[PDB]
Design a protein around this ligand. Structure first.
Ligand SMILES: C[C@]12C[C@@]34CCC(=O)[C@@](C)(CCC(=O)Nc5c(O)ccc(C(=O)O)c5O)[C@@H]3[C@H](C[C@@H]1C4)O2
Ligand SMILES: C[C@]12C[C@@]34CCC(=O)[C@@](C)(CCC(=O)Nc5c(O)ccc(C(=O)O)c5O)[C@@H]3[C@H](C[C@@H]1C4)O2
Lengths: 411, 411
C-alpha cells in the first residue's frame, strides 16, 4: 500500500509569481483581474482577464529556446522548475527511471497557433514555423521538463479542459501508488487570454462582460453573476511516495488521500441543475480516501461565476454534505484569480494544501448578494480562521461533463 | 486482482471504415495513401496523405449536431459507437456509474481552428463560432460519447501527441483494474490532414515528400525513407473487467496484460540513436505483464518511416529481445496506413489484438532495401502465418520523448 504526499510546489498566477506570494494575496482578498492590453479589445465584448504580471524566464529558458514555445509552455516550465527546486529532490542515474510527470492544459498554445495561422494566410505554408507542432501541443510542458531534469519515468498529459489540473494530479498519484514511479511533477498550464480564447468563450456567451469594473466581475454564487473570468497561470506539485520522501528528509506539505472522477452525461457546455455529476466525483473521492463528508473542513469549489454552474455545484454540495452542509466552508478563489482552465485544478490544489498547513481558508470575494435558498457557508468577503481542519477537498469540472475531485489530508 | 479484456472494437482508417474491412486490407498489403484534394496543395511540399474515404455519420450524428464538431470528433464518435455496439453492453441505471471513457487525440480540431481563425481575421471576433471551444478541444470525443450513451463513470482524455492511443488504452485499463470503473471505451481520434497539419509537420521537415508515388512513401526501415506519412482515422476498444465480461456472456477478443511508460529526456522532436526510451517502455510492459521478451510473438512497431526514429526502435528491439531478436516478428502497419498520430496507438492496438485471434501478422510494405546491420524480421512485403502466438506488444512514441507500450495476451 503506497501513500502519496506533496513535497514541492510551484506556481504562476494573476496574483503572484510564486507559491507564497500567491497565497498571501488570496488570504488578503486581492483580485488579479485587469484590462487586456496586449491585443486590441475594441470589438471584444470582454476586455479584461487575470494576467500573469511581469513574467520572466530569462534565467530558466534561453530566448533561443523561448522561440520554440508558447506562453503556456514557458509558464508551465517555470512553475515546474520552482516545484522541482522547492522539493530538494536530486535526480541521479538510480532515480531518473522512477521520476516522471503528468502535466496538461485545457486549450494549449493558442497564441502561437494564431501566429502560425496568420503567417500561412499572409504568405503560404512557407511561413509556418518548423516549431508549429512542438511549440503548441499540450504535452510540451512535460516534454521540456523531463528533458531539463533527465526524468525518464512515466510522462503523460491529460487534456480534460477545465478539469485537467485535478486529473493530472489524480493520475500522477495513481501512477505513483501503482508502482510505476516514485515521484511525479504534476499539474497544468494555460495562457488563453488571446483573440481566440476571449473571442471563443465570448462567442459561447460564457464570459463576464463587466468591463466597467473588471475586479468585481468574478462573483461566484452572487445574484449578479454574468459568466466566468479568464485567468492565465500554471500550478505544479511534486508528488512522492511516503517512504521515498521520508528516507530523503523531504519537507511534506500534505498527503493526497482521495481522487474521484465522474461524467455528467448531460450537455456539452453545461451541467445538470441537480449537479449529479459533481456529486458523484466528490462521492468517489471520499470513498477513495475512506472518510465521510463530515470530515472535510473546506471545499475549494470549481465556482466559476456562471449562472448555471454555480447553482449546480451548490446543489451537489448540499447533496454530499447534507447535515454538515452548513458546517463545511466552501469558497471559490476564482473570485480573485479568474478561471485558469487546465491550470485551475492545479493552482487550486495548492490552495487546498496551504489551507491545511496554515489552518486558514481564503474568501469568495464579491459575494454581495448570494443566491436565495442556499444554506451554505461560501466564506464571503474575508479569509476565515479554522481550528482542527485535517482534510480539504478540491473540485474541478469541464466541458464534456468531465468531473474530478481531490482530497488532501493534513500530514 | 482485476484483469482487463477487450470486448468491443470500432475503427475508421485509410484502408477501411470498419474493423474487419481494415484488417482484411492490411493482411492484403494494401495502401490507403492518396493525393490530397480538399485543399490546394500547390505550395505544399507534401501533397498526399492517408485519408478516410467516404466518411458517413448521417445515421449516427445529425447535421444539426455535426455543425458543432471537427472531423476528428465525428470520426471518434462513429468509431466509438461501432465499438459500443460490437460489445453488446447494455447501459442501465445500475451500470451508468461504472462505465466511462479515456479518449484522446494528438492535435485535435485543426480544421475548425483554421475556420474560426480565418473568420476572425476576415470579420472580427463577431465571426468566431459559439462552438469554437467545444468543437475543437481534445476531450470532446469522450464528451459526446458519454452523453450519447448515458455513461457516468470516469472520463479522461490523454493528449500525448503520437503516443495518445496507447496511453488512453493503458490508463483506461488502469482505471478498470484500480476499481474506479468496470468498463471503458478507450482509444483516440485524429484528422490532421489540413494546411496547418501538413504545413506544420512539413515545416519541421518530418514528412515524406515522395509525391511521384504516394503509395510507396511510407517505407519503415527502408534505406530510401524520407519522413513519415500523415493518416486520419479513429480506433476504439471497449475494455472490461474479466468477471463483468463473462457474467454477461461477452465476446472476448483478447486480454490487456501489460502497460509501460517511459521518457526519453533527450530531444523535443527526436529520440536518441540508442532508443533507450523505447527500450524502457517495452521493458516496463513486460515486467507489468510478468512475462519475458521471448514470449512476444509479434511487435506492432511505431515505425514511422523517418530516418532517425526507425533506427532507434530497431536498436531498442535488439536490446529488449537480444537472443530472440531474430525470432520475434516486427512490422509497421504505418507502411500502409500512414501515421494517425493520436489514433495510431489505438488502431495499432486493434491490429495487435487481431493478429492474436487470427494467428496472422501484417506486413511492412515497401521494404525494398532494409538498413544495413539489422538482424530483425520486419515482415517485409507479405503477411505472415504464425503458430503458437500467445502475446503481442504494441509501441507508440511521441514528441517530448513520451513513450508507451501495451502487451496483449490470447484469451
Ligand atoms: C449553451 C450554454 C448554456 C449557458 C447557460 C448560462 C451559463 O451559465 C453558461 C454561460 C455556462 C454553463 C456552465 O457553467 N458551463 C461549464 C461547465 O459545464 C463545466 C465547466 C465550466 C467552466 O467554466 O469550468 C463551465 O462554464 C452556459 C454555456 C454557454 C451557453 C449559455 O452553455
Ligand atoms: C529536429 C529534427 C531532427 C530530424 C532528423 C531526421 C528525422 O528522422 C526527423 C524528421 C524525425 C525524428 C523522429 O523520428 N521524431 C519522432 C519522435 O521522436 C517521436 C514520434 C515521432 C512520430 O512521428 O511519431 C517522430 O517522428 C527529425 C525531426 C525533424 C528535424 C529533422 O526533428
Amino acid at each position: 500500500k503506497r501513500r502519496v504526499v506533496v513535497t514541492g510546489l510551484g506556481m504562476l498566477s494573476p496574483v503572484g509569481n510564486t507559491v507564497e506570494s500567491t497565497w498571501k494575496a488570496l488570504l488578503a482578498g486581492q483580485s488579479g483581474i485587469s484590462l487586456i492590453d496586449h491585443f486590441d479589445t475594441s470589438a471584444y465584448a470582454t476586455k479584461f482577464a487575470g494576467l500573469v504580471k511581469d513574467f520572466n524566464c530569462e534565467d530558466i529558458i534561453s530566448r533561443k529556446e523561448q522561440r520554440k514555445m508558447d506562453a503556456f509552455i514557458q509558464y508551465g516550465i517555470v512553475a515546474g522548475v520552482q516545484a522541482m527546486q522547492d522539493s530538494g529532490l536530486e535526480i541521479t542515474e538510480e532515480n531518473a527511471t522512477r521520476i516522471g510527470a503528468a502535466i496538461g492544459s485545457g486549450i494549449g498554445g493558442l497564441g502561437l497557433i494564431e501566429e502560425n495561422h496568420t503567417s500561412l494566410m499572409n504568405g503560404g505554408p512557407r511561413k509556418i514555423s518548423p516549431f508549429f507542432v512542438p511549440s503548441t501541443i499540450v504535452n510540451m510542458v512535460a516534454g521540456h521538463l523531463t528533458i531539463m531534469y533527465g526524468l525518464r519515468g512515466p510522462s503523460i498529459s491529460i487534456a480534460t479542459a477545465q478539469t485537467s489540473g485535478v486529473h493530472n494530479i489524480g493520475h500522477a498519484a495513481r501512477i505513483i501508488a501503482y508502482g510505476d514511479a516514485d515521484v511525479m511533477v504534476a499539474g497544468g498550464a494555460e495562457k488563453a487570454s488571446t483573440p481566440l480564447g476571449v473571442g471563443g468563450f465570448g462567442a459561447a456567451r460564457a464570459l463576464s462582460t463587466r468591463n466597467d469594473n473588471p475586479q468585481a466581475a468574478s462573483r461566484p454564487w452572487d445574484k449578479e453573476r454574468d459568466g466566468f473570468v479568464l485567468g492565465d497561470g500554471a500550478g505544479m506539485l511534486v508528488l512522492e511516495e511516503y517512504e521515498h520522501a521520508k528516507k530523503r528528509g523531504a519537507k511534506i506539505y500534505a498527503e493526497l488521500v482521495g481522487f474521484g472522477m465522474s461524467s455528467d452525461a448531460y450537455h456539452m457546455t453545461s451541467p445538470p441543475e441537480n449537479g449529479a455529476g459533481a456529486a458523484l466525483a466528490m462521492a468517489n473521492a471520499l470513498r477513495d480516501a475512506g472518510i465521510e463528508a463530515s470530515q472535510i473542513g473546506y471545499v475549494n469549489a470549481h465556482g466559476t461565476s456562471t449562472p448555471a454552474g454555480d447553482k449546480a455545484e451548490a446543489q451537489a454540495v448540499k447533496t454530499i454534505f447534507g447535515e454538515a452542509a452548513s458546517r463545511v466552508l466552501v469558497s471559490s478563489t476564482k473570485s480573485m484569480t479568474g478561471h485558469l482552465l487546465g491550470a485551475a485544478g492545479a493552482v487550486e490544489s495548492i490552495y487546498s494544501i496551504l489551507a491545511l498547513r496554515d489552518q486558514a481558508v481564503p474568501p469568495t470575494i464579491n459575494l454581495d448578494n448570494p443566491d436565495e435558498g442556499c444554506d451554505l457557508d461560501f466564506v464571503p468577503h474575508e479569509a476565515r480562521q479554522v481550528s482542527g481542519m485535517e482534510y480539504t477537498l478540491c473540485n474541478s469540472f469541464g466541458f464534456g461533463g468531465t468531473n474530478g475531485s481531490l482530497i488532501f489530508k493534513k500530514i
